[PDB]
Amino acid sequence: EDSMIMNQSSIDRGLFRSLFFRSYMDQEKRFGISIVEEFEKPTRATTLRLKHGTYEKLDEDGLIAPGVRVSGDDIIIGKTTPIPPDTEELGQRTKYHTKRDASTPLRSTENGIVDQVLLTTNQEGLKFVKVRMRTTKVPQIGDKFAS
Amino acid sequence: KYWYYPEFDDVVKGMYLRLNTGSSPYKVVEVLGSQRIKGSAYGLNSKENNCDMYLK
Amino acid sequence: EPKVNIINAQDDEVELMLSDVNLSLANSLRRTMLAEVPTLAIDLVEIKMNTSVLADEFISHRLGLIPLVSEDVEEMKYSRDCTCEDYCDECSVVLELSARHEGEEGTTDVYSSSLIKVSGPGNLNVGEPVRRDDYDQGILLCKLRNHQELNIRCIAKKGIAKEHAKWSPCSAIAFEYDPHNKLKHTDFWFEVDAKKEWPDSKYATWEEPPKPGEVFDYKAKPNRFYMTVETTGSLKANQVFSRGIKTLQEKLANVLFELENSR
Amino acid sequence: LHKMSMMAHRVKVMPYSTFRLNLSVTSPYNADFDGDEMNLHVPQSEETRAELSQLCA
Amino acid sequence: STTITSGLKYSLATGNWGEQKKAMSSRAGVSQVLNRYTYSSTLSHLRRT
Amino acid sequence: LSNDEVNSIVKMKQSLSSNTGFNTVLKKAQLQEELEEARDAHDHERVARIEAELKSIGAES
Amino acid sequence: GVKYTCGACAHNFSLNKSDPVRCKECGHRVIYKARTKRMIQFDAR
Amino acid sequence: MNAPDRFELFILPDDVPKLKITPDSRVPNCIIIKFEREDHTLANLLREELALYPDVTFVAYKVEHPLFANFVMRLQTEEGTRPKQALERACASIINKLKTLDHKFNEEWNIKN
Amino acid sequence: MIIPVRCFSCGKVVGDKWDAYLRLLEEGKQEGDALDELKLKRYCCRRMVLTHVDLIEKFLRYNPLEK
Amino acid sequence: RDPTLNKTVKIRQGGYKGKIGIVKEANGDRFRVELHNPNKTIPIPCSF
RNA sequence: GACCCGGGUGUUUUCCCCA
Ligand SMILES: [Mg+2]
Ligand SMILES: [Zn+2]
Ligand SMILES: [Zn+2]
Ligand SMILES: [Zn+2]
């Protein structure tokens, strides 16, 4: 019924093995005179409503570095947007939420190695990043082939 | 890293640094100023490190 | 009762004829040589720098496939059976590769001869990548241009071809019996005449063709098997054959011990 | 298209990432293995499990 | 200068061949994202009617 | 550093720049654009100089 | 604090999250991050 | 994603016995043997060795599924012989055959070296 | 992209014969004769060298991203 | 508060000897470590 | 004793997959 049998040893030797790249884009938006988004590693204290993934793979500038293995739901771009502060200045020792998280997580079903990170400026002069992820896909039961 | 700064001219003024006499006993010299010299581009650290700044 | 007769012998391939053995024994020997003789192959790659145009895992896959000399792999232990923390010298061999291109013109080829054995078991002849001669550069691994460098450290472990095809010592085992089809084990497709439409086997001269008036013999069994064992250079042909026999013996002895200890 | 396109099977957990069928049931489903996909629905009650095992099996 | 620039960019970006405020009743799908899965697919896409 | 300071440093290093493949390609492209502009203006005198400059700069390997 | 590489002249430098995104020596607008210093290991399979 | 580890083809878990024997009561003097982490290599060898013994009246094996590394063997001997003794005799006989084969190959290789 | 180390079908090492194959073709030998001279008998091995396309020579023409 | 979470770790015993990973779950006596070599996450005892 | 979280657009359009 249109199936086929493949040699496992040929697969081990590199038959029909391929390479997969996926790129992610993000940029800093401008909402007003002085309301800008920032690429940064958000902290559990100064930001609220963080993603459930892990932020420990981000660098100081909020961007992951190439060569780092990533898994699903990991944060590859760290971005925060400002929020008007609440009355928490009552008795909080500077530990009050002023920013909201807008980070970009890796897709839940995908994982791989960070291949190349690009940082530049858009037409408007704001920061603009692109992250490319690389993985290898080996043939297995269910993959589609054709003559 | 900093020779092309506009303020570097006044920054380097009066500084004391180790100098290769060449004629080698290293000695200290006092910077009386700097003077850009066109056409005297020289390798600073590598081949690509062309520099026109000169230290008097 | 079993007999062996060698036709051609070389360091890399032996062509021999088995006789007075069952077909099952010959096939089990072929399967054991193909996928159950332990060899040594690179199993971990630590990439300290790779600025070449090839992906890191591309080069890792290429490295894993390079055959390494596995003569004394019997003395070596399996990685999972070594009580040492991390890897010691008795369960792993460490090779290191460092390649670089100097100058602003030309292309540098990275060959398997550049793999340098750093550490391994004492006085055991294992780990060195296989070379055809003293002047053979070996397997082409990568190519580099100016300011591209490859600096890696590879660890070789002992395993069998069941786990991954890179540990297989043999390339292809030709296997053949009954060139003249006296046993009628196959029925020959044809258009006009089946005799002149099918090429003769390469061992057809080693057996007398059936007589025109001969009747079918229902009491006969396959008795003589012709098989050629080709190796990748990690093990010699005689070593592959002998170690396949020894592996089969060990498997049967393990079954026997299990039976005797079951009671 | 017809009521034989939904039938209740018994689960067997297996490795790899594809649903596996005995080839005799590929006729009522009008399915072959060139890329087709099929849907699986899990009953969540004793009553529903009994209905599936006694009616749609 | 924004009129022509924005009109051309919008029509080429979205594929709706017309003015932005008349998106309905305009011929859609004129402009498509180039298929770069393989070389033959790109060549086929560039010669499609 | 500011944007203006970066531009000034880049111009200074361009004055110091003896040669760079990317910059040579950019210069050749700019020269070709200037040459087509001169061609469209029917200036037979400028185009000769631009052609000579392009011939001198070119001949890559 | 973190290294960067220019997209045209391949010149290494660093930024302090306040400098304009630009190569210091050729003024290119596109820069790339440098590889991580962590250990990278592959199964060679 | 769901692909099992390759070492599970031959590495035996601690809680899984290598060799489980259960009697088959439908016919007299018959046992069912379940080999774990084995395949046609051992099974066919054992089956074709046992098929030649005059006191073994039924021997067969099957691999239930190619994706699981095990096989099950059915053995059934005459009244005098216990089946497990026949299995042990088969193992020992094949071991002797392999030993003499190795010796003869070594002799021939040394002659033709 | 670059010559495979092992033949896919059987597993013979063909990764060390690319340079020799090109040298033989340079001298005017036919492709079949060149493959025969390298002792590639099985056609499964012959297709590996015969149908290989060398793309790394095109990737290397791009300026390296670091220095 | 599980100080070994999000820390690079190496496996010294079992079927994954000498593989670099990162600890993801640290409930207790059974650590979930993602492997850098393949794309998978495995449980492992703390002693390993 | 310093103690760890829990959230996700919408509307169009296009190009694909299995019948
Ligand atoms: Mg179909
Ligand atoms: Zn050890
Ligand atoms: Zn630059
Ligand atoms: Zn082959």
* Sequence spans of domains, chain I: 1-66
- Kindly identify the ligand whose nearest atom is closest to the C-alpha of F22: 3
Buried b (16+ CB within 10 A) or exposed e, H71-94: bbbbbbbeeebebbebbebbbeeb
Task: Quote the CA–CA distance of C64 and G43 in Å, as a whole number.
Answer: 9
What is the CA angle D41-D43-D45, rounded to 5? 165
* J20 in contact with nucleic chain K (CB within 7 A): no
Domain parsing of chain C, residue ranges: 1-38+166-263, 39-165
Contact A65, G36 (CB under 8 A): yes
F16 with B6: Cβ contact below 8 A: no
The CB density around residue B45, as the number of other CB atoms within 10 Å, is 7
Q: Which of H109, H110, H111, H113 would best serve as a mutation to test chain C binding (most C beta carbons within 10 A)? A: H109
- Kind and range of the H or E element at C246? helix C237-262
Total tally of structural domains belonging to chain J: 1
Contact, J27 CB vs strand K, < 7 Å: no
Alpha carbon dihedral C160, C163, C165, C171, in 10-degree steps, equals: 40
- Beta-bridge partners for G30: A120
First vs last C-alpha separation in chain E = 32
CB atoms closer than 10 angstroms to residue A128: 20
> Does residue J2 contact residue C72 with C-beta atoms inside 8 Å?
no
Distance C217 CA to K7 C1' (A): 80
**For residues J19 and A114, what is the distance between their CA atoms, to the nearest angstrom?**
19
* Three-state secondary structure call for residue C32: helix
From the CA of J23, how far away is ligand 1's center (Å)?
43
> Cβ(H71)–Cβ(H39) under 8 Å?
yes
Chain K bases closer than 7 A to any CB of the protein: 2-8, 12-15, 17-19
Where in chain G are the domains? 1-45
> How far, in Å, CA of B32 to CA of A4, rounded?
84
Q: Which residue has the tokens 């969540």?
A: D44
Which residues in C lie closer than 8 A to residue J15 (C-beta atoms)? 80
Q: What is the dihedral of CA B26, B29, B33, B39, to 10 degrees?
A: -20
Cα–Cα distance for residue pair F24/F26, rounded to 1 Å: 5
Which protein residue has its CA closest to C1' of K6? A52
Residue of J nearest to G41 (CA): J37
CATH homologous superfamily for the domain C39-165: DNA-directed RNA polymerase, insert domain (2.170.120.12)
Domain H1-113 CATH superfamily: RNA polymerase, RBP11-like subunit (3.30.1360.10)
For chain H, the first-to-last Cα distance in angstroms comes to: 50
I34: helix, strand or coil: helix
> Which 3 state secondary structure label does DSSP give F28?
helix
Q: Which residues contact H105 (CB under 8 A, 6 or more apart)?
A: C4, C6, C16, C238, C241, C242, C245
- Start-to-end CA distance of chain B, whole Å, equals 19
Burial of D29 from C-beta contacts in 10 A (0-12 / 13-18 / 19+): middle
CB contact under 8 A, I5 and C62: yes
CA distance H69 to H38: 6
Name chain B contacts of F11, Cβ cutoff 8 Å.
none
Q: How far apart are CA H109 and CA H111, in angstroms?
A: 5
**What is the distance between the alpha carbons of residues A114 and A132, in angstroms, rounded to a whole number?**
6
The integer distance in angstroms from the CA atom of J25 to the C1' atom of K2 is: 20
Q: How far apart are CA I3 and CA I17, in angstroms?
A: 9
Both structure tokens of C125: 């002849």
Alpha-carbon distance of B26 to B48, in angstroms, equals 26
Instruction: List, in order, residues 6 or more apart from D1 with CB less than 8 Å away.
Output: D30
Q: What are phi and psi of E20, to 5 degrees?
A: -65, -40
- Cβ A106 vs Cβ A76: under 8 Å: yes
Q: What is the interface size between C and I, counted as CB pairs within 8 Å?
A: 66
DSSP class of I13? B
Query: Looking at the C1' of nucleotide K2, which residue has the nearest alpha carbon?
Result: J1
At C32, phi and psi to the nearest 5? Answer: -65, -45
Residue in chain J lying closest to G43 (CA): J37
Nearest-CA distance from J7 to chain A in Å?
9
**Proximity of residue E29 CB to strand K below 7 A:** yes
Which residue in the set H44, H102, H113 is minimally distant from C242, CB to CB?
A: H102
What are all long-range contacts of H59-68, with beta carbons under 8 Å and residues at least 24 apart? H63/H39, H67/D14, H67/D15, H67/D16
- Mode of pairing for the β-strands spanning A99-101 and A47-48: parallel
Query: Taking Cα atoms as reference points, which of J36, J39, J8, J42 lies closest to residue J22?
Result: J8
Q: State the binding site of I.
A: 7, 10, 44-45
H-J contacts at Cβ under 8 angstroms:
4
Q: Is J45 exposed, middle or buried (0-12, 13-18, 19+ CB in 10 A)?
A: exposed
CA-based nearest residue to A113, from A137, A129, A132, A139: A132
Q: Measured in angstroms, how far is the CA atom of residue C92 from the centroid of ligand 2?
A: 7
Residues of A designated as active site:
2
Residue B39, C-beta contacts closer than 8 angstroms, at least 6 positions apart: none
Interface contact J25, partner A, CB < 8 A: no
Q: What is the DSSP string of C110-163?
A: EEGGG-EEEE-STT--EEEEP-SSSS----EEEEE-TT-EEEEEEEEEEE-TTT
**Protein CA A52 to sugar C1' K4 (Å):** 11
Do C1-38+166-263 and C39-165 show the same overall fold? no
Residue A97, class by beta-carbon neighbours within 10 Å (0-12 exposed, 13-18 middle, 19+ buried)? middle
Rg (chain G; Cα; Å): 14
Q: How far apart are the first and last CA of chain G?
A: 36
Token representation of residue C199: 């090429």
List the strands of the sheet with A38-39, edge to edge.
A38-39, A79-82, A99-101, A47-48
**What is the A11 CA–ligand 4 centroid distance (Å)?**
14
- Angle subtended at Cα G39 by Cα I55 and Cα G45, rounded to the nearest 5 degrees: 50
- Find the discontinuities in chain A where C to next N exceeds 2.5 angstroms and give the residue preceding each: none
The residues, ordered by sequence, that sit 6+ positions from A17 with a Cβ below 8 Å of its Cβ are A11, A136, A137, A138, A139, C61
Distance CA C195, CA C182 (A): 13
Collapsing DSSP states into helix, strand and coil, what is residue J25? strand
Q: How many angstroms separate the CA of D35 from the C1' of K17?
A: 8
Q: Assess contact for C63 and J1: CB atoms under 8 A.
A: no
Q: Between β-strands J20-25 and J31-35, what pairing exists: parallel, antiparallel or unpaired?
A: antiparallel
Three-state SS at J46: coil
G8 is in an annotated binding site: no
Contacts of C58 in chain A (CB under 8 A): 19
Question: Residue J28: which domain range?
Answer: 2-48
Q: Determine the residue of chain J that is closest to G39 in CA distance.
A: J20
Got the DSSP string for G1-45? -EEEEESSS--EEEE-SSS-SS-TTT--SEEEEPPPSS--EE---
**Which class would CATH give C1-38+166-263?**
alpha beta
Amino acid at A79: K
Strands (DSSP E) along chain E, which ranges? none
Does nucleic acid strand K have an atom less than 7 angstroms from the CB of A48?
no
- Spelled out in words, what is the top-level CATH class assigned to the domain I1-66? mainly alpha
Backbone φ and ψ of H49, nearest 5°: -70, -45
Residue C144: count of CB within 10 angstroms of its CB: 22
Which of A53, A29, A34, A46 is CA-nearest to residue A103? A53
Contact C9, H112 (CB under 8 A): yes
Identify whether the C-beta of residue H28 lies closer than 8 Å to the C-beta of residue H35: no
Q: At H57, is the secondary structure helix, strand, or coil? A: strand
- Give the contacts of F30 (CB within 8 A, at least 6 positions apart): none
Check: CATH 3.40.50.920 for G1-45?
Answer: no
- Specify the nucleotide whose C1' lies closest to residue A56 (CA): K4
Contacts of C183 (CB under 8 A, 6+ apart): C220, C221, C222
Return the residue of J nearest to C61 by Cα: J37
For B9, list phi and psi in degrees, rounded to 5.
-60, -45
| CA distance, residue G32 to nearest chain I CA (Å) | 9
Query: Position of tokens 């530049």?
Result: A120
Would you list the domain boundaries of chain H?
1-113
Decide: H32 and H24 in contact? Cβ < 8 Å.
Answer: yes
CA distance H37 to chain D (A): 17
Phi first, then psi, for residue H41 (nearest 5°) are -60, -50
Q: With the C-alpha atoms ordered J14, J16, J18, J19, is the resulting torsion angle positive or negative?
A: negative
Tokens of B6: 């506009």
In whole angstroms, K11 C1' to E34 CA is 24
Touching E: which chains, 3+ CB pairs < 8 A? none
Structure's resolution in angstroms: 3.8
What's the CA-to-centroid distance between C179 and ligand 3, angstroms? Answer: 71
Q: Cα of E36 to ligand 1 centre, how many Å?
A: 26
Please tell me if residue G8 touches chain F, with a CB cutoff of 8 Å: yes
